[PDB]
């Protein structure tokens, strides 16, 4: 086997075996010392050479002394068989695992609209007339310069301008110092409208030049002269981005004043600005003060309610900041205080709705994980089709992305919409970004409605060009969803899908990992020839914390189809039922029985279609189980209801008793004896490794003693006649 | 155990999660012994003065600090709280991790070298550190940590790996430097042990060996025994 071929000696270049991965310290860095470095070779023992030569000599005898007798008596199918990468292996921030990549979308032009209803945060250069001549000269230097520096600021998180750009461009260095000589002596009223221009429009959150430090003194001296909301503008001006540019004490002051003077902020929009700015608070105690206030001030319009959902969506209080011990599901009770306070207004007048205020509801609900707000959507179903032609490029994606996952990732719509929205997509196709395009390609496969005409002209080349690269890591997944829903099998396309993940410098996020592990067992069932090892290092960090059983406490509540048949399995009849059992940390089977590898999966309003067919999820899952020899009883919840009540219990018994026996035989027939075969071959691979090689060679001939063992080949015979041929 | 045996037989299949999980951590650590985590640490502090004497600080529960500098650099001595100092130990990474000190707008890199405690009283006397600068050589301690290998044939059975040195002293010339060293001893044997030059050949370009500290490259770290039965049979006979 392998070990006999081993070298008697290893050089210094061969002690450390090769690796699939480089480390982050083999990078090319500034300073370097390979040049002056000398090479070291491990010495050979002086007495070993006296052993190396002799064995070389006795081997040399038998070569000639036998040749003298003759005169007397006569692969890597990813990157081809050659060429393959080597993934850099590093330690990783949490950030890579919870970051929505900002490539593949002109973000800020898109993102500034959705807030634009908040007037007070809208930056205005001309509001600062004294410096507007200066500030604008700076931005010319930004875009006009080489690269795309300002455009890389929020986008390429690996890139910074507070150190690379501003600290080196000497024209700008003059300009920021022209400011400092002015900042101290301005009115206290112009400061926050300046800070917005720094943080967003210029990306100066740091205190490099020492600018904010002067703003603090000119600010803190006149805190009491401000109104309420003109302090909130500082909060959003500084704390909305990565460095909270201000200090602690200057923010504790703002943080302490405001929650005393909530009795005087006049409007509900003024709470909207407030909550959206104070969303990063770690203290729970004061979110309640806000929401306790909003439960007091009734709303009498419709733009107000939109202005709360879109804000309350992003500005939730995460559960990791909450304590470990707490009232059950208390995060939800924070929601419905609002949603019960809003449900009237958003429901009474939803016909009164327009394209700019249109988008923010679909988002506000999808981010809120509910299934109640259908009535607004029906009033929206009627809205789009009328204005279908006059729509913008922007209002198309968010609809296609919104209705796709309307009621908790179950869609909501009709064939009238999406068939109409093809044309609206075909109009603005060149204007969408790669994120928007994939999100269309999700919604159709989500319903199995892709035109074969539509995949050819636009999707097919787009994927061919950009699947291998030039595609952000987050957009592969909406593609990874759909293709398996399309049941595609073209290998040349799955290559690029894998080559990207292997080549991509960024690790896989847990936010987007569920497809990447589905698509694994998709390809493995089809193609066993691949090696997904590189495709696991990129998935290494996510799989550690990954568990499917976390879904249990929710499904136990919000699925009556699950329990009611579950009641029958346990109380009335008798099997070794288990319940939710996680299929290799990828699925959780609805109901199962073991050791027989049995499954009772269920269709429902989540998983059926208007046609009555299963959703393209519910056929995906039932492939993978069957691929791993895991019996199935695809139950349809309608048909079980239709059975007469006395015959509902035995009908399950008649099926399950049969599906058991099919597997009960299969275990006897194939697996049970076949494990001994692998076992007894596993036992050799150990005994192969326990060998004294020098003792076992003992010359050039190999004479192993052989143990006889009773083995019942009577069951299996393909392997007998497969081994008895090669072995002799 | 915590559930009756009669129920465990029904759920014997469940325990794959147990073993499939331990794949993940112990492999992750075993390959992450080498790499510094990419996470910035900061220590607010204050300057030294001739006024702040030791015993004055030590009722206030502050601590002195000392830094030794390198070529052409001056030394720096600072004041800090005790609970900062112990928290700096309490990381995994304390032997090498880069810690900063913010006095004001300034930051000073450092490493841990050691701490002295008053042994009879058992309170913190000082916390000593070593400067780090990018463009110049800097002393660090690279511990050696040996992986297990069931791929060699002598290592598996009746032999014993011998780690004669715990770490290596080097000089680093760049920002990110490796936390430690990890070895796969398959190709080693009784005949050849590992020697420091086998490491010197395999390092980044920014690293060099501090010959002032070590004795010779022909020095050896990992040694492997012979078999035990071949002794034991001879021991009895």
């Amino acid at each position: 086997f392998k070990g006999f071929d081993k070298n008697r000696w290893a050089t210094s270049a061969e002690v450390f075996p090769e690796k699939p991965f480089k480390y982050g310290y083999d990078k090319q860095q500034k300073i370097k010392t390979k040049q002056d470095r000398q090479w070291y070779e491990a010495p050979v023992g002086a007495m070993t050479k006296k052993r190396f030569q002799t064995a070389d000599f006795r081997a040399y005898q038998t070569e000639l002394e036998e040749a003298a007798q003759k005169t007397l008596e006569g692969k890597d199918e990813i990157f081809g068989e050659q060429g393959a990468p080597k993934r850099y292996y590093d330690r990783i921030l949490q950030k890579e695992l919870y970051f929505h990549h900002r490539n593949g979308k002109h973000f800020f032009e898109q993102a500034d609209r959705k807030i634009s209803f908040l007037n007070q945060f809208t930056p205005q250069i001309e509001k600062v007339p004294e410096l507007a001549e200066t500030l604008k000269t700076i931005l010319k230097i930004a875009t006009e310069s080489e690269g795309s520096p300002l455009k890389r600021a929020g986008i390429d998180q690996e890139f910074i301008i507070e150190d690379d750009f501003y600290s080196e461009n000497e024209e700008c260095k003059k300009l920021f110092e022209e400011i400092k000589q002015k900042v101290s002596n301005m009115n206290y009223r112009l400061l926050p409208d300046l800070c917005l221009v720094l943080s967003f429009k210029l990306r100066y959150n740091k205190d490099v030049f020492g600018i904010w430090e002067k703003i603090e003194q000119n600010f803190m001296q006149s805190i009491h002269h401000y109104p309420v909301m003109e302090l909130v503008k500082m909060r959003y001006a500084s704390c909305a981005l990565s460095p909270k540019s201000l200090s602690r004490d200057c923010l504790k002051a703002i943080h302490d004043i405001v929650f005393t003077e909530l009795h005087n902020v006049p409007s509900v929009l003024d709470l909207s600005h407030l909550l959206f700015a104070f969303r990063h608070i770690n203290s729970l105690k004061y979110y309640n003060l806000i929401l306790d206030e909003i439960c007091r001030r009734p709303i009498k319009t419709l733009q107000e309610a939109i202005a709360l959902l879109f804000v309350f969506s992003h500005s939730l209080f995460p559960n990791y900041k909450r304590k470990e011990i707490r009232e059950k599901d208390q995060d939800l009770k924070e929601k419905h205080k609002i949603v019960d306070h809003l449900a009237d207004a958003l429901a009474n007048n939803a016909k009164q709705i327009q394209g700019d205020d249109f988008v923010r509801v679909l988002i506000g609900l999808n981010n809120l994980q509910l299934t109640t707000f259908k009535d607004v959507l029906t009033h929206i179903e009627r809205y789009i089709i009328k204005n279908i032609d006059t729509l913008d490029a922007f209002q198309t994606s968010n609809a296609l992305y919104g209705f796709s996952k309307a009621n908790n990732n179950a869609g909501f719509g009709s064939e009238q919409l999406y068939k109409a929205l093809q044309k609206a997509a075909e109009k603005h196709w060149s204007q969408f970004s790669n994120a928007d395009k994939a999100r269309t390609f999700y919604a159709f496969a989500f319903q199995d409605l892709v035109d074969p005409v539509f995949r050819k002209k636009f999707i097919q080349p787009w994927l061919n060009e950009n699947l291998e690269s030039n595609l952000s890591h987050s957009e592969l997944h909406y593609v990874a969803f759909s293709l398996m829903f399309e049941q595609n099998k073209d290998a040349e396309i799955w290559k690029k899908f894998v080559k990207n993940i292997c080549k991509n410098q960024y690790v896989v996020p847990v936010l987007n990992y569920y497809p990447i592990k589905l698509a694994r067992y998709y390809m493995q069932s089809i193609f066993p020839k691949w090696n997904f090892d590189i495709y696991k290092l990129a998935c290494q960090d996510a799989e550690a914390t990954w568990d499917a059983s976390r879904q249990i406490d929710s499904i136990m509540e919000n699925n009556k189809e699950w329990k009611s048949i579950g009641v029958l399995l346990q109380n009335r009849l008798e099997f070794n039922s288990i319940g939710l059992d996680n299929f290799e940390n990828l699925l959780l089977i609805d109901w199962a029985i073991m050791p027989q590898r049995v499954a009772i999966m269920i269709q429902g309003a989540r998983q059926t279609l208007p046609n009555g067919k299963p959703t393209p999820l519910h056929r995906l899952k039932l492939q993978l189980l069957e691929n791993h020899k895991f019996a199935v009883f695809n139950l349809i919840y309608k048909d079980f209801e239709a059975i007469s009540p006395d015959q509902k219990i035995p009908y399950l018994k008649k099926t399950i008793e049969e599906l058991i026996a099919k597997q009960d035989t299969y275990i006897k027939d194939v697996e049970e004896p076949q494990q001994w075969l692998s076992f007894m071959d596993r036992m050799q691979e150990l005994t192969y490794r326990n060998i004294m090689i020098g003792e076992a060679t003992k010359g050039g001939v190999i004479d192993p003693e052989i143990q006889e063992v009773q083995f019942d080949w009577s069951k299996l015979q393909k392997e007998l006649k497969e081994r008895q041929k090669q072995e002799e | 155990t915590i559930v009756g045996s009669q129920f465990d037989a029904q759920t014997e299949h469940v325990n794959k999660l147990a073993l499939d999980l331990a794949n993940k951590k112990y492999r992750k650590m075993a390959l992450d012994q080498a790499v510094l985590r990419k996470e910035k640490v900061v220590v607010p502090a204050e300057f030294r003065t001739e006024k702040d004497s030791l015993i004055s600080l030590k009722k206030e529960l502050r601590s002195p600090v000392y830094i030794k500098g390198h070529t052409g650099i001056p030394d720096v001595d600072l004041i800090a709280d005790n609970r900062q100092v112990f928290s700096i130990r309490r990381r995994l990474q304390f032997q090498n991790q880069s810690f900063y000190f913010k006095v004001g707008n300034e930051e000073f890199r450092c490493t841990y070298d050691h701490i002295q405690i008053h042994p009879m009283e058992k309170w913190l006397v000082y916390s000593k550190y070593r400067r780090y600068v990018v463009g110049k050589p800097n002393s660090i301690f690279l511990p050696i940590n040996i992986l297990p290998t069931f791929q060699n044939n002598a290592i598996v059975r009746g032999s014993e790996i011998v780690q004669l040195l715990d770490g290596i002293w080097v000089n680093s010339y760049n920002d990110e430097y490796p936390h430690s060293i990890v070895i796969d001893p398959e190709n080693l044997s009784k005949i050849r042990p590992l020697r420091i030059g086998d490491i010197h050949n395999f390092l980044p370009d920014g690293v060099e060996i501090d010959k002032t500290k070590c004795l010779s490259l022909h020095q050896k770290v990992i040694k492997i025994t012979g078999d035990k039965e071949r002794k034991l049979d001879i021991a009895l006979q």
């Binding site: 921030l93 950030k95 890579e96 998180q157 690996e158 890139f159 910074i160 803190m220 001296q221 006149s222 805190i223 009491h224 990565s242 460095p243 504790k252 002051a253 302490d256 004043i257 005393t260 003077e261 | 990419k38 996470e39 910035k40 640490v41 900061v42 220590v43 607010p44 709280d81 609970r83 900062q84 928290s87 700096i88």
Partner: peptide, 30 residues
């Protein structure tokens, strides 16, 4: 990834947790 995050290392025993109304920041200017 060139993130600005950084672990501050300091004892929270010193940091006072009290409230200061508009008045406290009004009077201190004078």
């Amino acid at each position: 990834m060139r993130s600005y995050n950084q672990t501050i290392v300091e004892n929270q025993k010193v940091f006072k947790n009290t409230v200061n109304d508009r008045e406290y920041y009004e009077l201190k200017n004078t």
